[PDB]
């Protein structure tokens, strides 16, 4: 489906998509994400999702879970 339905993304220069693009020889890809819970908080404290150094926003004090 990627190689036929989204050619305005993955076929501008004819690069294409293969199984090796993600796995790179590994059964589990190296760069996947999940819904991040963030640092632990006290039981009665409401999390903010920011003000914490994180590599997911390149080490800035911005909201560290933009994936969801």
């Amino acid at each position: 489906a990627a190689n036929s339905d989204w050619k305005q993304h993955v076929a501008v220069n004819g690069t294409g998509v293969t199984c090796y693009t993600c796995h790179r020889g590994n059964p589990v890809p190296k760069y996947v994400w999940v819904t991040d819970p963030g640092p632990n908080q006290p039981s009665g404290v409401k999390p903010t999702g920011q003000n914490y150094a994180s590599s997911t926003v390149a080490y800035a004090a911005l909201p560290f879970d933009p994936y969801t």
Binding site: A53, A58, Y59, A60
Partner: protein
Amino acid sequence: AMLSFERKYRVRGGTLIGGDLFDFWVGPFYVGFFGVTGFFFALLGVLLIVWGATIGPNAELQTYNIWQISIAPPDLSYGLGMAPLTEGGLWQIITICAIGAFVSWALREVEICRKLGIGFHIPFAFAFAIGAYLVLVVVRPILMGAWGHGFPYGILSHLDWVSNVGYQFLHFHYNPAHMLAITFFFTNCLALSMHGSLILSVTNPQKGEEVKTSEHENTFFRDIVGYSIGALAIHRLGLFLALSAVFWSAVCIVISGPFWTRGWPEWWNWWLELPLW
């Protein structure tokens, strides 16, 4: 012309170059040899800026609106060579003229203070701003590799240049030398406000009161913050802060690109990767 107490100080001599050839005054100004050179460098620079506005970027976008006039540097494909006049060489000629004019101004100040018999603090302080300009248009383009890295000459276009250069590093606030320079600028503004306020308050007391003495100046700031720096030391500190701001701004701009090619927040990883935590 002359102030009512100025005629005592118009003496002959103290020139650096020229002797008696250009030793005269034109109205209130003293010219000298460097006055002639600087004035004509400035005149040619102005005339070339006006001609560059007359030509415009094209024949359709040419305009005499002062906010929109812009003279742009060459392309990055010319490297450090000399570009054609219509394609960015006018910028290089104007840059040379500007450097000549600034250096002439500083040397004329040196001559004036040699004539008056005073210290050389003022041209020395001006040299810092000249050096910041030279880092902006000479040192960084050579380290990067092309004249195209300089900023364009325009009232509103060089703001676009500053914005795009800032966003080339994704978050420019995280540059550490930038933080130091900003701290110095804000502190300088605070100190200037306080110095002016105190001098005016002492010189203009409450109605029906006499002029305050030197003890009141020290007592006021010892009773507000518990320390007073003094009359000479406040000027020392003002000069120090104003020059440190410019020095650290020059450092901050000369390390962006030549010495660091990633985002600025990432630079702090050395602190976050220590084995202590």
